[PDB]
Enzyme design. Structure first.
Site, PDB file in Angstrom:
ATOM      1  N   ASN A  95      -7.244   7.830   2.116  1.00 24.63           N
ATOM      2  CA  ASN A  95      -6.976   7.317   3.454  1.00 24.63           C
ATOM      3  C   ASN A  95      -7.866   8.012   4.483  1.00 24.63           C
ATOM      4  OD1 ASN A  95      -5.099   5.739   5.221  1.00 24.63           O
ATOM      5  ND2 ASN A  95      -4.987   7.764   6.247  1.00 24.63           N
ATOM      6  N   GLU A  96      -8.677   7.223   5.193  1.00 29.51           N
ATOM      7  CA  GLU A  96      -9.389   7.722   6.389  1.00 29.51           C
ATOM      8  C   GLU A  96     -10.185   9.020   6.190  1.00 29.51           C
ATOM      9  OE1 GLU A  96      -6.653   7.626   9.742  1.00 29.51           O
ATOM     10  OE2 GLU A  96      -6.180   5.508   9.457  1.00 29.51           O
ATOM     11  N   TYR A 143      -6.482  -0.221  14.796  1.00 27.88           N
ATOM     12  CA  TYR A 143      -5.629   0.103  15.951  1.00 27.88           C
ATOM     13  C   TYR A 143      -6.463  -0.134  17.196  1.00 27.88           C
ATOM     14  CZ  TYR A 143      -2.723   2.013  12.237  1.00 27.88           C
ATOM     15  OH  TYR A 143      -1.959   2.178  11.100  1.00 27.88           O
ATOM     16  N   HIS A 191      -9.120   0.172   9.410  1.00 23.12           N
ATOM     17  CA  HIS A 191      -7.791   0.340  10.003  1.00 23.12           C
ATOM     18  C   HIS A 191      -7.886  -0.099  11.437  1.00 23.12           C
ATOM     19  CE1 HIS A 191      -6.475   3.450   6.733  1.00 23.12           C
ATOM     20  NE2 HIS A 191      -6.831   2.267   6.244  1.00 23.12           N
ATOM     21  N   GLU A 204      -4.760  -1.030   7.263  1.00 26.45           N
ATOM     22  CA  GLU A 204      -3.665  -0.749   8.222  1.00 26.45           C
ATOM     23  C   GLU A 204      -3.959  -1.461   9.518  1.00 26.45           C
ATOM     24  OE1 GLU A 204      -3.107   3.425   9.011  1.00 26.45           O
ATOM     25  OE2 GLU A 204      -3.243   3.984   6.888  1.00 26.45           O
ATOM     26  N   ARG A 222       0.882  -1.170   0.000  1.00 31.88           N
ATOM     27  CA  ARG A 222       0.000   0.000   0.000  1.00 31.88           C
ATOM     28  C   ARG A 222       0.922   1.222   0.000  1.00 31.88           C
ATOM     29  NH1 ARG A 222      -3.124   2.888   4.216  1.00 31.88           N
ATOM     30  NH2 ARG A 222      -4.946   3.913   3.221  1.00 31.88           N
TER      31      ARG A 222
END
Ligand code: NA
Length: 308
Positions: free
Chosen positions: A124-125, A192, A190, A220, A50
């Site tokens: 992204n995001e 986390y 993602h 991610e 990526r």
């Protein structure tokens, strides 16, 4: 040719399911490293890289010749390139989304013709707030523009909430998918500390997408550290169970306080960190589970050639 989505499976251009097993590379911040980082990542067994690009919003813009260069490096190293624009990270602003969309359209000549090796992760995001409807509105609006500009790649759409509000996809992903006139859109979470903090959370967050027959990558994710819990073991084991893709964050170059997320000490990947060894050599990691896209071997799927 190339990639396409049917239900919760991503298929390569030869109709073979493709389960991403790879690594994020923060190209936009370390532009000169491409010809080093890209082969080094491939040497770890990644089937997908990526590539963090900038549209000039928060960092130096990656121009069309840079995009061509990184795509060529990925192809030469037999990795699928997930290209992504990072400058609208956490922004609710439709303006910031539109700048990312305009960038892909601007750079279309670097992308058209590479639909069997490149997947476009729109932003992204994008959409930092914790809801789904306004997030869905953005993609419903812009996806047709990407198609009408001539981009037929599989598109990848990050969850709302800085990638950590996967309920957005569970609730509105079908609506976003339906707005793609090519019906060729997949989603990314993602993981986390909010979306991947424990085993139950990892599994529920995956299930809520794939049980809707929508294709998913964990685009991610991190790992447990002093400050915080992320369950990398369950991300890897459950992704293998379900055929879900994942892309670890990140090869090298995190800020000081997040450098526990560097996979490698060096750009050339001669000295992996503990995190790098976990991803590359550990249970359900790249060496155990990563298979290359079949596009990278030009053998026509075992067709016998006629005798001469
Ligand atoms: Na003959």
């Amino acid at each position: 040719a190339g990639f396409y989505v049917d239900g919760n499976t991503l298929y390569d251009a030869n109709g073979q399911p493709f389960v991403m097993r790879g690594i994020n590379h923060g190209h936009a911040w370390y532009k000169d490293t491409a010809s080093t980082a890209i082969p080094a990542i491939a040497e770890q067994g990644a089937n997908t890289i990526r590539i963090v690009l900038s549209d000039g919003g928060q960092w130096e813009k990656d121009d069309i010749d840079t995009i061509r260069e990184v795509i060529e490096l990925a192809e030469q190293n037999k990795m699928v390139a997930v290209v992504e624009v990072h400058d609208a990270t956490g922004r609710d602003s439709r303006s910031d989304l539109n700048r990312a969309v305009d960038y892909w359209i601007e750079m279309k000549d670097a992308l058209i013709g590479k639909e069997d090796t490149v997947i476009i992760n729109i932003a992204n995001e994008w959409y930092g707030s914790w809801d789904g409807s306004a997030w869905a509105d953005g993609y419903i609006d812009v996806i047709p523009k990407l198609r009408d500009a001539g981009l037929t790649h599989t598109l990848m759409v990050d969850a709302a909430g800085w990638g950590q509000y996967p309920q957005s996809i569970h609730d509105y992903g079908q609506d976003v998918f339906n707005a793609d006139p090519l019906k060729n859109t997949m989603f990314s979470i993602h993981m986390y500390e909010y979306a991947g903090g424990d085993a139950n959370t990892v599994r529920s967050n995956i299930d809520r997408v794939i049980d809707q027959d929508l294709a998913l990558v964990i685009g991610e994710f991190g790992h447990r550290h002093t400050d915080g819990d992320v369950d990398e073991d369950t991300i890897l084991s459950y992704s293998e169970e379900t055929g879900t893709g994942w892309l670890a964050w990140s090869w090298k170059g995190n800020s000081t306080e997040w450098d526990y997320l560097d996979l490698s000490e060096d750009w050339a990947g001669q000295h992996l960190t503990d995190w790098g060894n976990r991803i590359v050599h550990g249970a359900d990691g790249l060496q155990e589970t990563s298979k290359p896209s079949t596009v990278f071997t030009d053998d026509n799927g075992g067709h016998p050639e006629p005798p001469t």
